[PDB]
Design a binder for this molecule. Structure first.
Ligand code: DCP
Ligand code: MG
Length: 331
């Protein structure tokens, strides 16, 4: 048997069922595009189960005794095994609605609601968006300006270069301040859509005003194409960096988040993901332990108390879970 919650089982980076999980994730994504959140979660859960299996699923008999594998997810896997293709998945892939929603939602600063509105208004292509600049936020304009580079997978080599310039700027702005790589790259991914950094300082409060100083330093070096700073809850800057490369350059999305050191373990846990892993962890916390977990803390609503954590391990322990390092959180 395999545990029900993704936070109770290791999910490694590489697995034996990538065709099957990809097909179920197409159905999940399509469901999200239609506002069908229940169905999204159900397909995401089923895909996540296949990622945790130790062996390839070669026959339908292998599905026995697995949680979150309802009739619909089973039929999809059955059609793939028997016929090499699932007609429902291929129809989604080929549909203009899905292709356009994928196109729009991929753009920096565009969510499902915005993409759906644009679809309903007859917009289909990136050129259609550029013909209607009054419909775009500044963030979305920047996303369109750099859309080719931003739909080029970010590589580990890009991350290492970016972490060096961010660490240099952070270290020059404030000695003692630290930079931690989070997101999918912390989980061991070889590529990604962006780079996530979490910034703090060991003395509570010394992190105040640090981010704008970091940003000034980076902007002075020609490294910033776009930056949106927001105070609100963590201070963060959603950016597009201009990454120099041999003979050229490429735009790369980078999120910089500042957390006070008291909240750092919660922020690190939340920001490391995966998105599904953290969804499952918060659900586990609430339903199984009566506690409310977020990126800032772990709250007992009965006692009106906050858990003091020094580490991610403290949080797992406090919730009665065996610790999973980041590379086993790839749910
Ligand atoms: N709706 C969201 C969005 C984000 N996150 C958390 C989990 C993610 O791991 C982390 C960083 O978000 P990203 O969108 O950068 O996701 P990843 O870095 O995990 O994936 P990618 O490789 O696509 O960047 O923030 C979350 O829990 N829920
Ligand atoms: Mg990321």
């Amino acid at each position: 048997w395999m545990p029900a919650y993704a936070c109770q089982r290791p999910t490694p980076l590489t697995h034996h069922n990538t065709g099957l999980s990809e097909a179920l994730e197409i159905l999940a994504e399509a469901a999200g595009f239609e506002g069908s959140e229940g169905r999204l979660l159900t397909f995401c859960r089923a895909a996540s189960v296949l990622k945790a299996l130790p062996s390839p699923v070669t026959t339908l008999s292998q599905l026995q005794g697995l949680p979150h594998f309802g009739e619909h997810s089973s039929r999809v896997v059955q059609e793939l095994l028997e016929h090499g293709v699932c007609e429902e998945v291929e129809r989604v892939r080929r549909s203009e609605r899905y292709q356009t929603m994928k196109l729009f939602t991929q753009i920096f600063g565009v969510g499902v609601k915005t993409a759906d509105r644009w679809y309903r208004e007859g917009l289909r292509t990136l050129d259609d968006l550029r013909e209607q600049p009054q419909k775009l936020t500044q963030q979305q304009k920047a996303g369109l300006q750099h859309h080719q580079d931003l739909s080029t997978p970010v590589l580990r080599s890009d991350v290492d270069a970016l972490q060096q310039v961010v660490e240099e700027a952070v270290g020059q702005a404030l000695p003692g301040a630290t930079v931690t790589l989070t997101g999918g790259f912390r989980r061991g991914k070889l590529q990604g859509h962006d780079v996530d950094f979490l910034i703090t300082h060991p003395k509570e409060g010394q992190e105040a005003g640090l981010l704008p100083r970091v940003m000034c330093r980076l902007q002075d070096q020609g490294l910033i194409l776009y930056h949106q700073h927001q105070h609100s809850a963590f201070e963060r800057s959603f950016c597009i960096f201009r990454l120099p490369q041999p003979g050229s350059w490429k735009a790369v999305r980078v999120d910089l988040v500042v957390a006070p050191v008291s909240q750092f373990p919660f922020a690190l846990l939340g920001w490391t993901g995966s998105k599904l892993f953290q969804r499952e962890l918060r659900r586990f916390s609430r339903k199984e332990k009566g506690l409310w977990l977020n990126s800032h803390g772990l709250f007992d609503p009965e006692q009106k108390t906050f858990f003091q954590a020094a580490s991610e391990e403290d949080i797992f322990r406090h919730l009665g879970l065996e610790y999973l390092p980041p590379e086993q959180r790839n749910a």
